Amino acid sequence: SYNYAEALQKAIYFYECQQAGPLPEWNRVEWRGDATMNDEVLGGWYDAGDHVKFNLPMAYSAAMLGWALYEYGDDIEASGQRLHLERNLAFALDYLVACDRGDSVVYQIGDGAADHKWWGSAEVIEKEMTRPYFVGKGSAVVGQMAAALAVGSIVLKNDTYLRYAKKYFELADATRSDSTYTAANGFYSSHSGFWDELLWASTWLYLATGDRNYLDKAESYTPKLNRQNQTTDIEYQWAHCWDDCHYGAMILLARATGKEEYHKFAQMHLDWWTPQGYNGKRVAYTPGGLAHLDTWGPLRYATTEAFLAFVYADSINDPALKQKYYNFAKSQIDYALGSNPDNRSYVVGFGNNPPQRPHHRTAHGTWLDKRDIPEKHRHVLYGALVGGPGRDDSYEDNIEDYVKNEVACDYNAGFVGALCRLTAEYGGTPLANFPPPEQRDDEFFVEAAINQASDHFTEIKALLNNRSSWPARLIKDLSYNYYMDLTEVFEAGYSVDDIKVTIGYCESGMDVEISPITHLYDNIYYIKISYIDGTNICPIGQEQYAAELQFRIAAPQGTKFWDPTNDFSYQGLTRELAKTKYMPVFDGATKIFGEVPGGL
Amino acid sequence: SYNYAEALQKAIYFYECQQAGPLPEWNRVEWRGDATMNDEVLGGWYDAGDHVKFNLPMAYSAAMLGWALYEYGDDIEASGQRLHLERNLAFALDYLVACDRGDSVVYQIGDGAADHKWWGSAEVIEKEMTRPYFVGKGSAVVGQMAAALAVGSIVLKNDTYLRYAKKYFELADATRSDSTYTAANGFYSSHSGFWDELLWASTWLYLATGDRNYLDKAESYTPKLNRQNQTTDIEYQWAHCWDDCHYGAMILLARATGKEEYHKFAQMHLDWWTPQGYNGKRVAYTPGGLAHLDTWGPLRYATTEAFLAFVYADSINDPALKQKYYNFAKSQIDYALGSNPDNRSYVVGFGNNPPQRPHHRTAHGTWLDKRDIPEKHRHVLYGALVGGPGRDDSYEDNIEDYVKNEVACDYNAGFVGALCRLTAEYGGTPLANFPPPEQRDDEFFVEAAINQASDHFTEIKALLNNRSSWPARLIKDLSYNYYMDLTEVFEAGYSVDDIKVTIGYCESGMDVEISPITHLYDNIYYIKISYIDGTNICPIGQEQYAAELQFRIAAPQGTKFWDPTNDFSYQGLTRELAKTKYMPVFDGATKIFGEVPGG
Ligand SMILES: [Ca+2]
Ligand SMILES: [Ca+2]
Ligand SMILES: [Ca+2]
Ligand SMILES: [Ca+2]
Ligand SMILES: [Cl-]
Ligand SMILES: [Cl-]
Ligand SMILES: [Cl-]
Ligand SMILES: [Cl-]
Ligand SMILES: [Cl-]
Ligand SMILES: [Cl-]
Ligand SMILES: [Cl-]
Ligand SMILES: [Cl-]
């Protein structure tokens, strides 16, 4: 129905857009560089369109990427995506290992409220704020980190991951408390408690080791799981997600023990998600066919359930159940890819009429802490599954809609597993030249205006801009030149030492020098304006993205010879600020924008 | 009893504080310089604690000083004040002549609203605003200008003043309208109309010339005067003042003609001012004995009536009436000088517990366009009669009380006349070395702070200040130097060129250059910060009184030898802005503040 291989290819690439510094050599994202290099634990993924490392959904996401490989890794070699998926997973797992503090782990990097208040690119955030870290032993977060490492250890044949999976599970299981999990409250609060994470982690450890202690542990946790409302049934009227993986764990335990209790649960849970429902109870459905669990991230939930439904259907023999669960799963993936009332993809950079304004700071590429400027994103966030439409299938592609246009690690995670299943069956060819190079716009440049003209001086207002985005970055040794023709000075009988440079304004905190007037060739002379710490010119807000200087170059008062109209850098200047290519910008001795007199 | 000669001396000196530029060479006020030199008409007096030239009260005030001389000029020799009063009057009269525009006159310099919105010194106001002028031929303003020049022609023996007096009288009398008198609205509106000015001017022209044609014109105007309420009597229940001089004109006509009608008016009017009243009717009196006509300028009114009463009493023979009017007059002057429930002078710089916070911008001497800072006036407005107390004798000396602490030309004018009469009688000695020199503050100076320090640089925040006040003034070629000792640099093996001058903030609008680093002597070096138009540093408001620059003097990055602790201009600097004498200030090549290495 769709090129599922291309969808998969893009859906994986999304995680490379999320990578924190240092980036691996193989990162394919031209607009991402090393970022947050001062973090207490390096690497791993930014969670969403923000720059926080939230370990609970991060580890959940990694676990689900592992699960995708565990089920379908062998079945997808024609898509050419296995190695991409593997190394993207390893990048996250390496971070979870690096978080170890023995009796505790680093479980968060960045303050949610502080991070979210600012809108700008990953690579420049350290100019705006200083990022804290958080340590604890919350059973949910540590149990999820254990689970991710347990499945990772299988699919990546890695004994280190298994060692740390066991370290973390033991800690989580001994602690039996979420009390030290606080830094993520209101962002990724532990809602369901921690028994489901212990179940999920122990189940994966059983599947990793075959050690029956882990199966016995797993089975011991089931009576501690939350009930469905006031009944005695284990809760089933929700989705497998970052907060609660018991749903998927029950499916895995149905396959592993073959016990009827696990099969009964899986069928009750999945039936509730299907159009036919479960004895009169059913998830809300949009008229367009999307199972719509909640206001936030409906596509995330429905596509994750699609993965669970595929795995369960593939693990059973009943033809009617297999067809019912398969059709449900494929229907939800196809809705996300364009089988909906608007015939449109909900995956950035894929299919027909994809979203172009995901709520994602670094893909946007602002310079001044605004969402509305630039009005179009500078970068393509390929593969990102957005939050999706409302309950009535309504949707508009708007950067301001932080619900419908949300993007996140956990949104993509189960989705990857479901695309693995579909490309395994249907094939499809990935895009050969992927990703294609972006059209860039100008990054470092001067905007200038005639601030005042006089019969004996020129006064310039000049703004040296850093609107970098490919990737956003900092240049320390920034300078620009203002070129003049002094022919008329010499012809009137004056000399270079008769011309005075003065300053009428220089912006606070921008350490700057202006050179003496310097000979280029013939009668062509220039001044260079140098910012000693040019990194302070950075795309982090209204004040910082450019440095303003007003300089005056003046012949003696009363003289009548000064002629700016033959000066190279005066060309095209008006009384309103405008970008000019005739005041070239330099990084050290290397010209990075503009033109010089006489060219190359 | 008071030293009325000293009070007179100071009350005259007040007018020197009021002079607009160019100042005469004899001006005695150390804190006044040439001000408002771009005005359409130069000289004359600022009206009050503001900088508007309002011709109606200015001319009234000059007419009153002329009248003082006319009556008492020969009688005030012991006081030594005749010459002072004379030349102060001529200064204003010269302004009145210079307003002539043929078919009209300049009658105002300044926009009252814009002038009053700003708080600062006369000498710097042109940096804040452009001052418009206004031309017209209002009968009241022109007629008062005529009167002032007519009495001035007599007492200063000046034919030119007489010619202009006649020309202005004729213009006012031809026009018979205040319709062209507009720019003073709400400040000095013509309330009484103009007939009283024509009466006052024609009376003075009669006294100047002896030409009975002017007497005939004067008498022709009295039926046109306003009535008292709905009655047939000429209005009498108010004071002679800048708006209405018919009161004094009638007293002059009583003496000149001897006619009963003028004497009846004069006694009706003065009786109403006295504690005994006019047929049961009387001006309000405070319990402390001040005749209190109105909320605004009660001392101005009472002291002006004192002068009228003295002149009328001196002109009659009846000893009972003479005593009654003389006692009234002296009681009011004495109230003003300290004979009141608080035993306090209402004349700045005189007597016991005088006002110290008159509502006067130039005597205050701020640099910030604020009334509250400085908290004490930097100058002494000697001789200014304030507005004064309320109806209950209540008063507080507060700069914000623009009623009770108002000061003005017209407030002093009748007062001088009355003081002439009292010093004529009592013959006191003026102060010998008047005025004494004031304590001054530093006017042009740097305030500096260490903005940032590191192992390889010094960064200074420097504010170059103009808080001038003796007098407030402007200096274009301003600079200051910053001196350093580089011994630590050569001793570690580095040179001068290992040192870079940069800027981290340059206040908008302050065109500046910093020289290259310069050797003084030995291992002592400096930089010079120069403002190209230093006049933009001026005591006109929060932004303008100082120019801020942040400059950094830097060795190469990473090194650790830099040692600011032996730099001359670094001495005493903290991380808080403070005045420093070690960053000296220059006007051109001349040091005006601070110290240099080696002296
Ligand atoms: Ca949980
Ligand atoms: Ca030229
Ligand atoms: Ca009048
Ligand atoms: Ca030193
Ligand atoms: Cl169904
Ligand atoms: Cl835009
Ligand atoms: Cl020339
Ligand atoms: Cl070029
Ligand atoms: Cl006119
Ligand atoms: Cl009486
Ligand atoms: Cl103060
Ligand atoms: Cl010295």
mmCIF file with all atom_site columns, N, CA, C and O in Angstrom, chain A residues 459 476 500-513 532 550 552, chain B residues 459 500-513 532 550 552 557:
data_model
loop_
_atom_site.group_PDB
_atom_site.id
_atom_site.type_symbol
_atom_site.label_atom_id
_atom_site.label_alt_id
_atom_site.label_comp_id
_atom_site.label_asym_id
_atom_site.label_entity_id
_atom_site.label_seq_id
_atom_site.pdbx_PDB_ins_code
_atom_site.Cartn_x
_atom_site.Cartn_y
_atom_site.Cartn_z
_atom_site.occupancy
_atom_site.B_iso_or_equiv
_atom_site.pdbx_formal_charge
_atom_site.auth_seq_id
_atom_site.auth_comp_id
_atom_site.auth_asym_id
_atom_site.auth_atom_id
_atom_site.pdbx_PDB_model_num
ATOM 1   N N  . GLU A 1 459 ? 28.758 57.430 7.988  1.00 0.00 ? 459 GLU A N  1
ATOM 2   C CA . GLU A 1 459 ? 28.547 56.702 9.228  1.00 0.00 ? 459 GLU A CA 1
ATOM 3   C C  . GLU A 1 459 ? 27.681 55.489 8.919  1.00 0.00 ? 459 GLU A C  1
ATOM 4   O O  . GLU A 1 459 ? 26.597 55.620 8.342  1.00 0.00 ? 459 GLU A O  1
ATOM 5   N N  . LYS A 1 476 ? 34.661 31.851 16.689 1.00 0.00 ? 476 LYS A N  1
ATOM 6   C CA . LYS A 1 476 ? 35.295 32.826 17.582 1.00 0.00 ? 476 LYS A CA 1
ATOM 7   C C  . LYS A 1 476 ? 35.968 33.985 16.842 1.00 0.00 ? 476 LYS A C  1
ATOM 8   O O  . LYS A 1 476 ? 35.792 35.147 17.217 1.00 0.00 ? 476 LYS A O  1
ATOM 9   N N  . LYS A 1 500 ? 39.534 60.204 10.059 1.00 0.00 ? 500 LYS A N  1
ATOM 10  C CA . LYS A 1 500 ? 39.363 59.742 11.439 1.00 0.00 ? 500 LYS A CA 1
ATOM 11  C C  . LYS A 1 500 ? 38.242 58.704 11.552 1.00 0.00 ? 500 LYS A C  1
ATOM 12  O O  . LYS A 1 500 ? 37.152 58.923 11.026 1.00 0.00 ? 500 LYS A O  1
ATOM 13  N N  . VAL A 1 501 ? 38.527 57.599 12.239 1.00 0.00 ? 501 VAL A N  1
ATOM 14  C CA . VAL A 1 501 ? 37.520 56.578 12.555 1.00 0.00 ? 501 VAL A CA 1
ATOM 15  C C  . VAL A 1 501 ? 37.055 56.767 13.993 1.00 0.00 ? 501 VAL A C  1
ATOM 16  O O  . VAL A 1 501 ? 37.863 56.818 14.924 1.00 0.00 ? 501 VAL A O  1
ATOM 17  N N  . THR A 1 502 ? 35.742 56.864 14.167 1.00 0.00 ? 502 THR A N  1
ATOM 18  C CA . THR A 1 502 ? 35.176 56.976 15.499 1.00 0.00 ? 502 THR A CA 1
ATOM 19  C C  . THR A 1 502 ? 33.989 56.024 15.594 1.00 0.00 ? 502 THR A C  1
ATOM 20  O O  . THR A 1 502 ? 33.548 55.443 14.591 1.00 0.00 ? 502 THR A O  1
ATOM 21  N N  . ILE A 1 503 ? 33.482 55.871 16.816 1.00 0.00 ? 503 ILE A N  1
ATOM 22  C CA . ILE A 1 503 ? 32.387 54.940 17.092 1.00 0.00 ? 503 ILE A CA 1
ATOM 23  C C  . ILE A 1 503 ? 31.255 55.738 17.720 1.00 0.00 ? 503 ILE A C  1
ATOM 24  O O  . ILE A 1 503 ? 31.488 56.534 18.633 1.00 0.00 ? 503 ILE A O  1
ATOM 25  N N  . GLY A 1 504 ? 30.043 55.511 17.225 1.00 0.00 ? 504 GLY A N  1
ATOM 26  C CA . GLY A 1 504 ? 28.850 56.173 17.730 1.00 0.00 ? 504 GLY A CA 1
ATOM 27  C C  . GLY A 1 504 ? 27.965 55.276 18.571 1.00 0.00 ? 504 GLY A C  1
ATOM 28  O O  . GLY A 1 504 ? 27.075 55.783 19.251 1.00 0.00 ? 504 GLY A O  1
ATOM 29  N N  . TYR A 1 505 ? 28.168 53.958 18.485 1.00 0.00 ? 505 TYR A N  1
ATOM 30  C CA . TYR A 1 505 ? 27.473 52.988 19.351 1.00 0.00 ? 505 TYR A CA 1
ATOM 31  C C  . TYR A 1 505 ? 28.169 51.645 19.203 1.00 0.00 ? 505 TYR A C  1
ATOM 32  O O  . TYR A 1 505 ? 28.557 51.250 18.099 1.00 0.00 ? 505 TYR A O  1
ATOM 33  N N  . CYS A 1 506 ? 28.340 50.947 20.320 1.00 0.00 ? 506 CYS A N  1
ATOM 34  C CA . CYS A 1 506 ? 28.809 49.568 20.222 1.00 0.00 ? 506 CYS A CA 1
ATOM 35  C C  . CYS A 1 506 ? 28.096 48.742 21.280 1.00 0.00 ? 506 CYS A C  1
ATOM 36  O O  . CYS A 1 506 ? 28.063 49.086 22.456 1.00 0.00 ? 506 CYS A O  1
ATOM 37  N N  . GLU A 1 507 ? 27.464 47.671 20.815 1.00 0.00 ? 507 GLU A N  1
ATOM 38  C CA . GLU A 1 507 ? 26.543 46.883 21.626 1.00 0.00 ? 507 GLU A CA 1
ATOM 39  C C  . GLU A 1 507 ? 27.215 46.240 22.834 1.00 0.00 ? 507 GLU A C  1
ATOM 40  O O  . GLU A 1 507 ? 28.306 45.657 22.719 1.00 0.00 ? 507 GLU A O  1
ATOM 41  N N  . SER A 1 508 ? 26.550 46.325 23.984 1.00 0.00 ? 508 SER A N  1
ATOM 42  C CA . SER A 1 508 ? 27.095 45.778 25.221 1.00 0.00 ? 508 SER A CA 1
ATOM 43  C C  . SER A 1 508 ? 27.427 44.281 25.166 1.00 0.00 ? 508 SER A C  1
ATOM 44  O O  . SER A 1 508 ? 26.623 43.479 24.696 1.00 0.00 ? 508 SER A O  1
ATOM 45  N N  . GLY A 1 509 ? 28.599 43.933 25.691 1.00 0.00 ? 509 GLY A N  1
ATOM 46  C CA . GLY A 1 509 ? 29.073 42.557 25.793 1.00 0.00 ? 509 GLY A CA 1
ATOM 47  C C  . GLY A 1 509 ? 29.707 41.989 24.540 1.00 0.00 ? 509 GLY A C  1
ATOM 48  O O  . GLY A 1 509 ? 29.995 40.793 24.464 1.00 0.00 ? 509 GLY A O  1
ATOM 49  N N  . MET A 1 510 ? 29.895 42.834 23.534 1.00 0.00 ? 510 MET A N  1
ATOM 50  C CA . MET A 1 510 ? 30.519 42.407 22.283 1.00 0.00 ? 510 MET A CA 1
ATOM 51  C C  . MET A 1 510 ? 31.900 43.057 22.173 1.00 0.00 ? 510 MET A C  1
ATOM 52  O O  . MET A 1 510 ? 32.039 44.151 21.614 1.00 0.00 ? 510 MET A O  1
ATOM 53  N N  . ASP A 1 511 ? 32.908 42.407 22.763 1.00 0.00 ? 511 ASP A N  1
ATOM 54  C CA . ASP A 1 511 ? 34.292 42.899 22.772 1.00 0.00 ? 511 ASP A CA 1
ATOM 55  C C  . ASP A 1 511 ? 34.777 43.049 21.324 1.00 0.00 ? 511 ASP A C  1
ATOM 56  O O  . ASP A 1 511 ? 34.837 42.051 20.596 1.00 0.00 ? 511 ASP A O  1
ATOM 57  N N  . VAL A 1 512 ? 35.104 44.274 20.899 1.00 0.00 ? 512 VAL A N  1
ATOM 58  C CA . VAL A 1 512 ? 35.353 44.575 19.494 1.00 0.00 ? 512 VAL A CA 1
ATOM 59  C C  . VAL A 1 512 ? 36.538 45.527 19.315 1.00 0.00 ? 512 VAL A C  1
ATOM 60  O O  . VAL A 1 512 ? 36.802 46.385 20.158 1.00 0.00 ? 512 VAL A O  1
ATOM 61  N N  . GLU A 1 513 ? 37.258 45.366 18.212 1.00 0.00 ? 513 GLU A N  1
ATOM 62  C CA . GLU A 1 513 ? 38.265 46.339 17.810 1.00 0.00 ? 513 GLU A CA 1
ATOM 63  C C  . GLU A 1 513 ? 38.064 46.734 16.351 1.00 0.00 ? 513 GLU A C  1
ATOM 64  O O  . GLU A 1 513 ? 37.499 45.973 15.556 1.00 0.00 ? 513 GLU A O  1
ATOM 65  N N  . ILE A 1 532 ? 36.462 39.827 19.238 1.00 0.00 ? 532 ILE A N  1
ATOM 66  C CA . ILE A 1 532 ? 37.528 39.026 19.825 1.00 0.00 ? 532 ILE A CA 1
ATOM 67  C C  . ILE A 1 532 ? 36.971 37.692 20.309 1.00 0.00 ? 532 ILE A C  1
ATOM 68  O O  . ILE A 1 532 ? 37.600 36.643 20.118 1.00 0.00 ? 532 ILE A O  1
ATOM 69  N N  . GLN A 1 550 ? 28.092 51.080 15.281 1.00 0.00 ? 550 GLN A N  1
ATOM 70  C CA . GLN A 1 550 ? 27.939 52.266 14.441 1.00 0.00 ? 550 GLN A CA 1
ATOM 71  C C  . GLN A 1 550 ? 29.311 52.900 14.384 1.00 0.00 ? 550 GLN A C  1
ATOM 72  O O  . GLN A 1 550 ? 29.868 53.290 15.410 1.00 0.00 ? 550 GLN A O  1
ATOM 73  N N  . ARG A 1 552 ? 31.989 55.692 12.258 1.00 0.00 ? 552 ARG A N  1
ATOM 74  C CA . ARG A 1 552 ? 32.087 56.853 11.384 1.00 0.00 ? 552 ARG A CA 1
ATOM 75  C C  . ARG A 1 552 ? 33.509 56.955 10.844 1.00 0.00 ? 552 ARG A C  1
ATOM 76  O O  . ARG A 1 552 ? 34.478 56.796 11.598 1.00 0.00 ? 552 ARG A O  1
ATOM 77  N N  . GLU B 2 459 ? 39.283 45.261 32.376 1.00 0.00 ? 459 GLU B N  1
ATOM 78  C CA . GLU B 2 459 ? 38.173 45.945 31.713 1.00 0.00 ? 459 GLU B CA 1
ATOM 79  C C  . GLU B 2 459 ? 37.540 46.981 32.639 1.00 0.00 ? 459 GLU B C  1
ATOM 80  O O  . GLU B 2 459 ? 37.054 46.639 33.720 1.00 0.00 ? 459 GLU B O  1
ATOM 81  N N  . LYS B 2 500 ? 46.308 44.743 23.518 1.00 0.00 ? 500 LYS B N  1
ATOM 82  C CA . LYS B 2 500 ? 45.268 45.140 22.562 1.00 0.00 ? 500 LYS B CA 1
ATOM 83  C C  . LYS B 2 500 ? 44.208 45.986 23.264 1.00 0.00 ? 500 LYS B C  1
ATOM 84  O O  . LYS B 2 500 ? 43.794 45.641 24.367 1.00 0.00 ? 500 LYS B O  1
ATOM 85  N N  . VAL B 2 501 ? 43.802 47.080 22.624 1.00 0.00 ? 501 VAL B N  1
ATOM 86  C CA . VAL B 2 501 ? 42.723 47.931 23.145 1.00 0.00 ? 501 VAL B CA 1
ATOM 87  C C  . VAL B 2 501 ? 41.427 47.563 22.435 1.00 0.00 ? 501 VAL B C  1
ATOM 88  O O  . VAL B 2 501 ? 41.332 47.651 21.202 1.00 0.00 ? 501 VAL B O  1
ATOM 89  N N  . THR B 2 502 ? 40.417 47.188 23.220 1.00 0.00 ? 502 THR B N  1
ATOM 90  C CA . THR B 2 502 ? 39.087 46.899 22.666 1.00 0.00 ? 502 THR B CA 1
ATOM 91  C C  . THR B 2 502 ? 37.973 47.607 23.433 1.00 0.00 ? 502 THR B C  1
ATOM 92  O O  . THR B 2 502 ? 38.206 48.149 24.522 1.00 0.00 ? 502 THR B O  1
ATOM 93  N N  . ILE B 2 503 ? 36.779 47.611 22.848 1.00 0.00 ? 503 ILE B N  1
ATOM 94  C CA . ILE B 2 503 ? 35.608 48.187 23.501 1.00 0.00 ? 503 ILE B CA 1
ATOM 95  C C  . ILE B 2 503 ? 34.535 47.120 23.679 1.00 0.00 ? 503 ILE B C  1
ATOM 96  O O  . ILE B 2 503 ? 34.303 46.297 22.786 1.00 0.00 ? 503 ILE B O  1
ATOM 97  N N  . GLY B 2 504 ? 33.872 47.154 24.831 1.00 0.00 ? 504 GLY B N  1
ATOM 98  C CA . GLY B 2 504 ? 32.764 46.252 25.127 1.00 0.00 ? 504 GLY B CA 1
ATOM 99  C C  . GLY B 2 504 ? 31.382 46.856 25.252 1.00 0.00 ? 504 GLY B C  1
ATOM 100 O O  . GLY B 2 504 ? 30.403 46.120 25.336 1.00 0.00 ? 504 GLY B O  1
ATOM 101 N N  . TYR B 2 505 ? 31.329 48.185 25.262 1.00 0.00 ? 505 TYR B N  1
ATOM 102 C CA . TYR B 2 505 ? 30.092 48.960 25.249 1.00 0.00 ? 505 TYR B CA 1
ATOM 103 C C  . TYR B 2 505 ? 30.453 50.417 24.986 1.00 0.00 ? 505 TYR B C  1
ATOM 104 O O  . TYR B 2 505 ? 31.367 50.969 25.597 1.00 0.00 ? 505 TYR B O  1
ATOM 105 N N  . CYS B 2 506 ? 29.719 51.026 24.064 1.00 0.00 ? 506 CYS B N  1
ATOM 106 C CA . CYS B 2 506 ? 29.882 52.444 23.732 1.00 0.00 ? 506 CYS B CA 1
ATOM 107 C C  . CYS B 2 506 ? 28.456 52.984 23.675 1.00 0.00 ? 506 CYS B C  1
ATOM 108 O O  . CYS B 2 506 ? 27.691 52.623 22.780 1.00 0.00 ? 506 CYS B O  1
ATOM 109 N N  . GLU B 2 507 ? 28.113 53.866 24.610 1.00 0.00 ? 507 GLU B N  1
ATOM 110 C CA . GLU B 2 507 ? 26.768 54.424 24.676 1.00 0.00 ? 507 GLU B CA 1
ATOM 111 C C  . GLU B 2 507 ? 26.366 55.100 23.369 1.00 0.00 ? 507 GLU B C  1
ATOM 112 O O  . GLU B 2 507 ? 27.140 55.881 22.797 1.00 0.00 ? 507 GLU B O  1
ATOM 113 N N  . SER B 2 508 ? 25.145 54.808 22.922 1.00 0.00 ? 508 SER B N  1
ATOM 114 C CA . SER B 2 508 ? 24.604 55.346 21.680 1.00 0.00 ? 508 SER B CA 1
ATOM 115 C C  . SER B 2 508 ? 24.567 56.867 21.731 1.00 0.00 ? 508 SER B C  1
ATOM 116 O O  . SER B 2 508 ? 24.168 57.452 22.741 1.00 0.00 ? 508 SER B O  1
ATOM 117 N N  . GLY B 2 509 ? 25.022 57.497 20.651 1.00 0.00 ? 509 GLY B N  1
ATOM 118 C CA . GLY B 2 509 ? 24.948 58.946 20.505 1.00 0.00 ? 509 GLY B CA 1
ATOM 119 C C  . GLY B 2 509 ? 26.167 59.706 20.986 1.00 0.00 ? 509 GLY B C  1
ATOM 120 O O  . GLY B 2 509 ? 26.237 60.927 20.830 1.00 0.00 ? 509 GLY B O  1
ATOM 121 N N  . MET B 2 510 ? 27.120 58.994 21.582 1.00 0.00 ? 510 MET B N  1
ATOM 122 C CA . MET B 2 510 ? 28.342 59.594 22.116 1.00 0.00 ? 510 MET B CA 1
ATOM 123 C C  . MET B 2 510 ? 29.526 59.238 21.223 1.00 0.00 ? 510 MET B C  1
ATOM 124 O O  . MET B 2 510 ? 30.227 58.258 21.482 1.00 0.00 ? 510 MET B O  1
ATOM 125 N N  . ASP B 2 511 ? 29.695 60.005 20.146 1.00 0.00 ? 511 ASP B N  1
ATOM 126 C CA . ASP B 2 511 ? 30.791 59.813 19.185 1.00 0.00 ? 511 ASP B CA 1
ATOM 127 C C  . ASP B 2 511 ? 32.129 59.862 19.903 1.00 0.00 ? 511 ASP B C  1
ATOM 128 O O  . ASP B 2 511 ? 32.481 60.915 20.451 1.00 0.00 ? 511 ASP B O  1
ATOM 129 N N  . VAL B 2 512 ? 32.844 58.741 19.875 1.00 0.00 ? 512 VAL B N  1
ATOM 130 C CA . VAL B 2 512 ? 34.042 58.542 20.663 1.00 0.00 ? 512 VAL B CA 1
ATOM 131 C C  . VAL B 2 512 ? 35.184 57.913 19.858 1.00 0.00 ? 512 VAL B C  1
ATOM 132 O O  . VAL B 2 512 ? 34.966 57.169 18.887 1.00 0.00 ? 512 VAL B O  1
ATOM 133 N N  . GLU B 2 513 ? 36.404 58.243 20.260 1.00 0.00 ? 513 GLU B N  1
ATOM 134 C CA . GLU B 2 513 ? 37.583 57.553 19.747 1.00 0.00 ? 513 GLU B CA 1
ATOM 135 C C  . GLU B 2 513 ? 38.511 57.317 20.927 1.00 0.00 ? 513 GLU B C  1
ATOM 136 O O  . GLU B 2 513 ? 38.506 58.075 21.903 1.00 0.00 ? 513 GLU B O  1
ATOM 137 N N  . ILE B 2 532 ? 34.028 63.412 20.572 1.00 0.00 ? 532 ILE B N  1
ATOM 138 C CA . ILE B 2 532 ? 34.152 64.361 19.469 1.00 0.00 ? 532 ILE B CA 1
ATOM 139 C C  . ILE B 2 532 ? 33.235 65.571 19.658 1.00 0.00 ? 532 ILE B C  1
ATOM 140 O O  . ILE B 2 532 ? 33.621 66.713 19.387 1.00 0.00 ? 532 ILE B O  1
ATOM 141 N N  . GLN B 2 550 ? 32.792 51.070 28.091 1.00 0.00 ? 550 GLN B N  1
ATOM 142 C CA . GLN B 2 550 ? 33.513 49.948 28.674 1.00 0.00 ? 550 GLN B CA 1
ATOM 143 C C  . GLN B 2 550 ? 34.679 49.651 27.748 1.00 0.00 ? 550 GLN B C  1
ATOM 144 O O  . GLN B 2 550 ? 34.469 49.403 26.561 1.00 0.00 ? 550 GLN B O  1
ATOM 145 N N  . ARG B 2 552 ? 38.632 47.636 27.360 1.00 0.00 ? 552 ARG B N  1
ATOM 146 C CA . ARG B 2 552 ? 39.451 46.527 27.830 1.00 0.00 ? 552 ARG B CA 1
ATOM 147 C C  . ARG B 2 552 ? 40.863 46.688 27.278 1.00 0.00 ? 552 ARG B C  1
ATOM 148 O O  . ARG B 2 552 ? 41.059 47.071 26.120 1.00 0.00 ? 552 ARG B O  1
ATOM 149 N N  . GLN B 2 557 ? 45.818 36.231 25.185 1.00 0.00 ? 557 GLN B N  1
ATOM 150 C CA . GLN B 2 557 ? 45.011 35.279 25.955 1.00 0.00 ? 557 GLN B CA 1
ATOM 151 C C  . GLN B 2 557 ? 45.827 34.128 26.553 1.00 0.00 ? 557 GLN B C  1
ATOM 152 O O  . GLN B 2 557 ? 46.779 33.652 25.938 1.00 0.00 ? 557 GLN B O  1
#
